[PDB]
Design a protein around this ligand. Sequence first.
Ligand SMILES: [Co+2]
Ligand SMILES: [Co+2]
Ligand SMILES: [Co+2]
Ligand SMILES: [Co+2]
Lengths: 295, 295
Amino acid sequence: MDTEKLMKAGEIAKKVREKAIKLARPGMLLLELAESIEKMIMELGGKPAFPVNLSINEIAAHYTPYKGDTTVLKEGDYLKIDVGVHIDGFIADTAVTVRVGMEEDELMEAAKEALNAAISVARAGVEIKELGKAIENEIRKRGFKPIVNLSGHKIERYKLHAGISIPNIYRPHDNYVLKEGDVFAIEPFATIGAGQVIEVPPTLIYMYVRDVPVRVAQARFLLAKIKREYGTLPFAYRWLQNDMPEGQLKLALKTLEKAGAIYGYPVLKEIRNGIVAQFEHTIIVEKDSVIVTTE
Amino acid sequence: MDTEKLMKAGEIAKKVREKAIKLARPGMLLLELAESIEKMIMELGGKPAFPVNLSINEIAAHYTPYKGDTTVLKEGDYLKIDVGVHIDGFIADTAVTVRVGMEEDELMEAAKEALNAAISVARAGVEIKELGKAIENEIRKRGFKPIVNLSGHKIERYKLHAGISIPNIYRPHDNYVLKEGDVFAIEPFATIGAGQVIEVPPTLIYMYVRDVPVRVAQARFLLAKIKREYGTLPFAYRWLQNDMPEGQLKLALKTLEKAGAIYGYPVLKEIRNGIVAQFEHTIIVEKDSVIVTTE
Ligand SMILES: [Co+2]
Ligand SMILES: [Co+2]
Ligand SMILES: [Co+2]
Ligand SMILES: [Co+2]
């Protein structure tokens, strides 16, 4: 409803993402990197739209450190930094892949070019299948495979994944027409593996879905807290770690997940352990072009 | 508006579908089969929602005979019969695979069970991803591959493919939640091939997409007929082969395509030419269950 906040969120997302790239040096602790970016988001005037994802190599997405994580970056690691910022619910979602301490390679170039190719065809009145075809052709002509179950997505106020997605493959019936004012995150994922991700432990990210009558008090009040503190945007297990002892925390989240009150987003790994590269920008559809808010 | 028109469309689609199975015998002309099915739809009181698709073996979908087509069913052929009926815009979309002159096999069973699995979990409140998972699990545990770029779809009045899809694979962000009153066609495709379909000539089905000024007169009268008789639902090239000679028809159709008035839907073939099996039903989502309009 207001492009000013979408542009502000995008400007902030761009700034933090570019600083995150500078911090991604061999030896950097992931936890330290994550907290710096999220603090930087704060210091600039926005709130995180979701916890910063730092996904290494075959880990495609949904990895955000936790208090006690000793993972450090290593030279040669294909680190995907996925950052989201929101200004009053208006979101900017962007991502880049850095090969730690090294230079970009062909796998990375395929994902980045696929993104450029989809932005180039996007405008009001274009069918989503057109973006999908653009993305897939760029990835496949370079000898890589697109990830079929991870895609771009429509973004609405306080709703990161609005329902309509922009696949990284051409689907003949993806006939949703981009409308003026539509906000979408386009995110090609390329890999040398099979082209599919699966969920694996641990679950570091969750999202509130519904108020469920939970009996045990500890879980009942956590839902209430999650509810008004995070609302409908994804939150990290890390964000709740100092609020209560880890043991009961894990139990409460489980109880809430088992009752269907919140849903967990387990780490996503490429099925054949193939390295995954990803690039992403958020766009606002205009009549004849698109505005890339995170560029 | 009314679940009654939806129920009515489904009853006719089922009857017609059950008749088509009986006629799928060796030596049957696809053209004879398509014409009989479509005439029966009209005899029963409905109008085709799309032309009867008769897709054999590696041809996954979008094949509908044309006048002069000599294709006949051979014993052993995996015939996918996809039929749709509408009653004043309210659609029933259903499909079955028959191994011509033979009994059902594991490939067909996987697709069928995948469908039954998705339906058993569907009800208001469930995210689309849960249906994707159910489908993918039944196809994969039997050793086959779900088709990644062909899938189920939300159905709206006079809109066969409404935007929201139900994939045959699990995607973690398919979080559209089924709502009471939603109408969807669940359609698992399974194959022994790679699991992906590509577009190949000919284009035997088209669909009116936008009201554009046509400079040519026969193209303009043609578009007038399309808008008048088919509206926004797909139509077969076959349905127009009598209005004007082939050459005039081809050129008028190309002018309309270039003008952006209609969109062509080429035949879909499994990329590694693997046999494709498909089953499909239309469902109306209820509070605690679903009505399968096409059973
Ligand atoms: Co992102
Ligand atoms: Co995204
Ligand atoms: Co169908
Ligand atoms: Co269908």
